[PDB]
A paper describes a structure:
The crystallized protein is comprised of a glycine left after cleavage of the expression and purification tag followed by KPN03535 residues 23–154. The final model contains ten monomers (chains A–J), two PEG molecules (PEG 600 fragments from the crystallization solution) and 323 water molecules in the asymmetric unit. The ten monomers are almost identical in structure and completeness and superimpose extremely well, with pairwise r.m.s.d. values ranging from only 0.2 to 0.4 Å. Residues 36–69 constitute three additional α-helices (α−2, α−1 and α0) which are not observed in other structures of the same fold. The capping helix α in KPN03535 is shorter than in the toxins and NlpE, although it is similar to that observed in BOF protein. In the crystal structure, the protein assembles as two stacked pentameric rings, formed by loose interdigitation of the ‘finger-like’ β1–L12–β2 structure, with outer and inner diameters of ∼80 Å and ∼40 Å, respectively, and a thickness of ∼40 Å. The buried surface area of each monomer within each pentamer (∼540 Å2) and each monomer in the interface between the two pentamers (∼600 Å2) is low. The quaternary structure analysis does not suggest sufficiently strong and extensive interactions to enable complex formation in solution, suggesting that these pentamers could be a crystallization artifact. Crystal-packing and assembly analysis using PISA supported by analytical size-exclusion chromatography and static light scattering suggest that a monomer is the likely oligomeric state. Analysis of the electrostatic surface potential indicates that KPN03535 most closely resembles PriB and aspartyl-tRNA synthetase, with a prominent positively charged area similar to the DNA-binding region of these two proteins.
Numbering used by the authors: 36 to 154
Write the structure that this text describes.
Amino acid sequence: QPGDDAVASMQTYSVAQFLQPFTLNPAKASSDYLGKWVKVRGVIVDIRRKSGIAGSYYFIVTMRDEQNKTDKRLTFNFGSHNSADVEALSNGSVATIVGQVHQVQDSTIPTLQNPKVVK
């Protein structure tokens, strides 16, 4: 996972910007981004705790473009160990979250993994 100074050093994408390549070809985009970390800024529109498999639970955080420059939403999957970050977000509030691209299947939009709320 990237630490604070590595995070401050990354470019901030809008949701529209990060999703643009996936809109063109998600197979290609998923392959180009595989394993990479992105820092995406947007408005949180849903936060939800979910029942996991094998005793676990996790959270899905959904984000829309800050200026509605796309209607597509980006989701992030936070494990139970990062409930502090999830509990500090707010629906309707702008946030910036760093997350990792894992393989995108059965979908055209990635669900960012191992996320970290920046601000």
